[PDB]
From Swiss-Prot, chains A, B, C, D:
One of its GO terms (cellular component) is cytoplasm. The keyword Transferase does not apply. Oligomer of 24 subunits. There are two types of subunits: L (light) chain and H (heavy) chain. The major chain can be light or heavy, depending on the species and tissue type. The functional molecule forms a roughly spherical shell with a diameter of 12 nm and contains a central cavity into which the insoluble mineral iron core is deposited. Interacts with NCOA4. Its main location: cytoplasm. Signal peptide: none annotated. Keywords: Acetylation, Cytoplasm, Cytoplasmic vesicle, Iron, Iron storage, Lysosome, Metal-binding. The keyword Electron transport does not apply. PANTHER family: FERRITIN, FERRITIN LIGHT CHAIN. It comes from Equus caballus. In horse spleen the light chain is the major chain. It is found in: Cytoplasmic vesicle, Autophagosome; Cytoplasm; Autolysosome. This is Ferritin light chain. Belongs to the ferritin family. It comes from the Eukaryota.
Length: 170, 170, 170, 170
């Protein structure tokens, strides 16, 4: 590469793996969104919450891909595994799964940061901090807040509580 | 007829019957709407939902009538049967009845399409596809979504759940 | 399903397979776009052409998914295979591959139309005609036009011809 | 110094050296720009590309100087060496030299980052990341893209390819 400078093969590979992880996350959210669009589930707030997250994750993958190219690495794509469920249960089930997923992304970002810091790659470490790390923290807090509110509600009376959350928060 | 071309007497008759079916559907929705306007029922959201459907069905009948004339057929009107109920129960009762009605309209459209396709009448087949078939599909999905939400709510606590649906969805 | 009407299990399955085919197509275009963004390839017109097609295909998948739900079918997702190449050669190589891909989508649409017509499913047949079939025809014509122009140019003098196409057409 | 806090003499000196390196880079770009303004070279796109980089580098030097003062260090200026060439050849020659120069700046930034990280100086490390490191990466990518395009073109037919690049990219 005519441009590549201070960009370890280890970081390049990990960036390609993270791209896979984000695209998988986008696919999981696509499936979550359409499940809540089913006529026998019918929570349009929840549907839109997860469809908007599908788009965020995709956009995360694309920004990683752009950076890869900016640093003179080579994008390499793998099979995208299907999501881990075909049916996603109730709103708390789905929000719990979303939080699990985000923690797995966040840990992958933290791992990749630690690798860049080992590799003395400050550009990478800035890039993650600027575009990914605080976004995850903010999103996980929001999901935490949602779960707490869903759990308050559906402890009370499940069907009613799930409706009211979708109506009045989402 | 000076205009009539490729327009079978079988399609003409079926169009006249479908016009009756839509006008009957509009009448059923008129009765549904005013029932929910009663002071001892008093769900204004539900009242407006069904009164707006009365108007849609009427407008369906008029578009069929216009097409009849465009193709050189003769509109022929029959008695309009009164709706099948005088009192329409609770919101889920009424939404169940609405879905039954729409499925009966949709099956009549599908039948008439099949007849036009037998009769090699592409104009008719386009006309139904453009103005009726997707509208029914969209409406039945919406009613399905509503029922699921009503059933979630009134499983919980019936009176409260019915109020909240009328307030927050309709 | 409370809504499902005239919607064969055969069409439902094929719709799920077509969703996979569109998402795979979007992934192929993602890879094409980022390849032309490489500093050692550096054709920004070509990059944008393929990235805009990634988005079109994704949006195709989502419209199929919405229809699935509208008809009372169940979305079911599979693994998304990685694209068939990691490096995509020159502009004519990439446009040839794109045309192959589109013909495969178009044949899948035509197959699914034929199935709906066997199954007497006019809604499906309209849906494809309205949102997919003419879009493919228009896109394949455009790609045909592009290839002819690329081939004229790079017959002449390859590097220069590829630059001028990216500059003056894309 | 009444303000100075956590600001090592080692960083202070290196900042003064980096200021020299940026001002030298601005001078090199000044010379590049006016060479392409010659009536016997006459590529106005190339002239403007390098004159705009002269200004960017100068502005880099001034931001380093401002930071020096913000941290309570003392700006110290040295002789500015003349650029390494009086005549800069063809467009690819000049873009190759520009890339060499930028890599030397980028390595100096990376060195200074590593020093701040040794010295536990997070302000410095942020300052570089925010104002310099991603700007270099973006600029080197752009120059890489340009070179690839220039090389495609002037492999074909040199004079023509150089004209077309200046016209249609710059």
């Amino acid at each position: 590469s005519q441009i590549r400078q201070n960009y370890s093969t280890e970081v390049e590979a990990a960036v390609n793996r993270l791209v896979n992880l984000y695209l998988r996350a986008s696919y999981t959210y696509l499936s979550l969104g359409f499940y809540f669009d089913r006529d026998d589930v019918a929570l349009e707030g929840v549907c839109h919450f997860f469809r908007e997250l599908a788009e965020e994750k995709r956009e995360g993958a694309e920004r990683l891909l752009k950076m890869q190219n900016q640093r003179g690495g080579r994008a390499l794509f793998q099979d995208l595994q299907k999501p881990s469920q075909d049916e996603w249960g109730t709103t708390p089930d789905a929000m719990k799964a979303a939080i699990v997923l985000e923690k797995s992304l966040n840990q992958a970002l933290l791992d990749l940061h630690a690798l860049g810091s080992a590799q003395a790659d400050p550009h990478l470490c800035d890039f993650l901090e600027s575009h990914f790390l605080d976004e995850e923290v903010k999103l996980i807090k929001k999901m935490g807040d949602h779960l707490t509110n869903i759990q308050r509600l559906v402890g009370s009376q499940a069907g009613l509580g799930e409706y009211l959350f979708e109506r009045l928060t989402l």
